[PDB]
From Swiss-Prot:
Active site: 286
Induction: Regulated by cAMP, dexamethasone, glucagon and by insulin. Dexamthasone, glucagon and cAMP increase levels, insulin decreases levels.
Modified residues (Phosphothreonine): 176
GO biological-process terms attached to the record: cellular hyperosmotic response; cellular hyperosmotic salinity response; cellular hypotonic response; cellular hypotonic salinity response; cellular response to cAMP; cellular response to dexamethasone stimulus; cellular response to fructose stimulus; cellular response to glucagon stimulus
Protein name as annotated: Phosphoenolpyruvate carboxykinase, cytosolic [GTP]
Organism, scientific name: Rattus norvegicus
């Protein structure tokens, strides 16, 4: 209905039909078209034709370049103001702040950012009205999970960015089939704008529309809305990924008895023909993708990848923790990727891949720090800043948080069960981060409650994945600091509660450190495929092997228990050393952090594990 002619957007639809949409989808699309005032509405179909045409259009406009060396690969270079997540501009809206974060004693929380509904309405009104003028609003129906799976969750993302459309086609299952699967069901409402209505009010930098000053990534869990303004960077604009499948989903999971986690899922097969699945939570840019598609150095071992970033898991009636990967692609850090470090990623990204903020070679290929491939004499390099570049120059040729965005189905070791709606049974959970000192290569938690404490106590050097600079060691509990959808204390309680579930077969919990350094700042452990030697030890421990010795922080490998054949130059004593002074300091730091940041919401069990660790260290 309407008394005039501005409410019904039918005449502005350039693909699809508002009449063909499910009723509630139409209302969502049209309501936001009324607000944002796009010139056109394009309902995505997910087809190869749509995708190729959109890419060519972006190429026309100078928004992306085709990489002529490869099969259907593309390179986007962004405004340098829009390169990573911004935690301080990422918020969750609830009636009560304590539902979203524990109230920190110190007054500033490091476990999320809350915004009142009043303040968010004002922020929304200062951003979205008219924001799509002169642009197309693309409507992206997407599934987090295989099309038609009983455990998939569907969303609709509205965006004015073709780059977002193309990247969502890779990272989710997208298009008409999803609308058909959705029918009259519920869907997560996702609204995104780059925040640059036409005619442009401000200079366009590097043909990359964005609004840094007004960037705001908001989540409204009771209304089932995600609303993101001003950034095109995938972590901020691919709304099915961090926003939905971690922040919204972790709160749903709390309410419904499951888990949504920042974890890879991999399957590993040993030389005796046994296969086990493991999950691992490491912070952004701290080794998940490389572990998930590892090429093991140990003969007779094989790793297969289920997912590299997000896991949705629950204990089933048989007691097994079963996990699914709700994503359809990998959005991986590019620098460091080489045939030696991640040969499976190199094979995956050679076709149908979008690269962002990497360098370009004159024969139409890609380049980045650590790529470890010599170029022919005469071949030149254009940096991610679109300037000619030479290896002798002061700055990197690729941004440190540059990315590939690639279909998971193309991974040569994609696991045969990666789309099974039954999920895969997790037998070990691994925590870890970047710790240049003090923390040994691997240890095993003493119990479930100890393992939840180990997750809670995680710390890691800052990376380029968000706004934190330098290499300051930060708390990042469960690798979820940027991603909790609700109060972290409550999340710890939820984890603890799993132990008391009927027939629960609780996975073993481990903590790793690939990143300990010697006195000269060189890594003590080579990592990458050599991490298979650590996974071997974990595998044996899951099977019940007596290959561990007790220490104050947990179980570690016995002398000679790790296979170090071919690594005679590793300094094992240094790499496994546990210093009373370091750990006295560590436990004091963890105590103060949990007291300040979790406070009244810290479960008794976790405080008890803290007291126990302090006491074990005191007996050293
Ligand atoms: N030294 C070392 N670096 C690693 C290892 N695994 C990954 N990296 C590097 O760390 C960065 C992030 O790796 P990635 O696996 O993409 O981490 P993710 O963001 O957690 O998925 C890349 O530059 C990798 O080359 C490892 O075992 N050792
Ligand atoms: Mn991640
Ligand atoms: Mn990754
Ligand atoms: Na650009």
């Amino acid at each position: 209905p309407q008394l005039h002619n501005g409410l019904d957007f039918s005449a502005k639809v350039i693909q699809g039909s508002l009449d063909s949409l499910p009723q509630e989808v139409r209302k969502f699309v049209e309501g936001n078209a009324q607000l944002c005032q796009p010139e056109y509405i394009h309902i995505c179909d997910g087809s190869e034709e749509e995708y190729g045409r959109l890419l060519a259009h972006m190429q026309e406009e100078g928004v992306i370049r085709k990489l002529k060396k490869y099969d259907n690969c593309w390179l986007a270079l962004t405004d340098p103001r829009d390169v990573a997540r911004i935690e301080s501009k990422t918020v969750i809206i609830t009636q009560e702040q304590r539902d979203t974060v524990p109230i920190p004693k110190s007054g500033q929380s490091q476990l999320g950012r809350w915004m009142s509904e009043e303040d968010f309405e004002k922020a929304f009104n200062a951003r979205f009205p008219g924001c799509m003028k002169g642009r197309t609003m693309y409507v992206i129906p997407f599934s987090m999970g295989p099309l038609g799976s009983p455990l998939a969750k569907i969303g609709i993302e509205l965006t004015d960015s073709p780059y977002v459309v193309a990247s969502m086609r890779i990272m989710t299952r997208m298009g008409t089939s999803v609308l058909e699967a959705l029918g009259d069901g519920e869907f997560i409402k996702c609204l995104h704008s780059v925040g640059c209505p036409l005619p442009l009010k401000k200079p366009l930098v590097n043909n990359w529309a964005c609004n840094p000053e007004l960037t705001l990534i908001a989540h409204l869990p009771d209304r089932r809305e995600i609303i993101s303004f001003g950034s095109g960077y995938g972590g901020n604009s691919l709304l099915g990924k961090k926003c939905f499948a971690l922040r919204i989903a972790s709160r749903l999971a709390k309410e419904e008895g499951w888990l949504a986690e920042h974890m890879l899922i991999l399957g590993i097969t040993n030389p005796e023909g046994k296969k086990k699945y493991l999950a691992a939570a490491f912070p952004s840019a701290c080794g998940k993708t490389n572990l998930a598609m590892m090429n093991p150095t140990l003969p007779g071992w094989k790793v297969e990848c289920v997912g590299d970033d997000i896991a949705w898991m629950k204990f089933d009636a048989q007691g097994n923790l079963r996990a699914i990967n709700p994503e359809n692609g990998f959005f991986g850090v590019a620098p460091g990727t080489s045939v030696k470090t991640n040969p499976n990623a190199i094979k995956t990204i050679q076709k149908n891949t979008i690269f962002t903020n990497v360098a370009e070679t004159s024969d139409g290929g890609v380049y980045w720090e650590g790529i470890d491939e010599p170029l022919a004499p005469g071949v030149t390099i254009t940096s991610w800043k679109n300037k000619e570049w030479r290896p002798q120059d002061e700055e990197p040729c690729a941004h440190p948080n540059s990315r590939f965005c690639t279909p998971a189905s193309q991974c040569p070791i994609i696991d045969p069960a990666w789309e099974s709606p039954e999920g895969v049974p997790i037998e070990g959970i691994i925590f870890g981060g970047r710790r240049p000192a003090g923390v040994p290569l691997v240890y095993e938690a003493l119990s479930w409650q100890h393992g939840v404490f180990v997750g809670a106590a995680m710390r890691s050097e800052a990376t380029a994945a968000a706004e934190h600079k330098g290499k300051v060691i930060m708390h990042d509990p469960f690798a979820m600091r940027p991603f909790f959808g609700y109060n972290f204390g409550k999340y710890l309680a939820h984890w603890l509660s799993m132990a008391h579930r009927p027939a629960a077969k609780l996975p073993k919990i481990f903590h790793v450190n690939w990143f300990r350094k010697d006195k000269n700042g060189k890594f003590l452990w080579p990592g990458f495929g050599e991490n298979s030697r650590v996974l071997e030890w974990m595998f044996g421990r899951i099977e019940g092997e007596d290959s561990a010795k007790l220490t104050p922080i947990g179980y570690v490998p016995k002398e000679d228990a790790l296979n170090l054949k071919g690594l005679g130059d590793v300094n094992v004593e240094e790499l496994f050393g546990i210093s009373k002074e370091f750990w006295e300091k560590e436990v004091e730091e963890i105590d103060k952090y949990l007291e300040d940041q979790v406070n009244a919401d810290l479960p008794y069990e976790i405080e008890r594990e803290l007291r126990a660790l302090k006491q074990r260290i005191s007996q050293m």
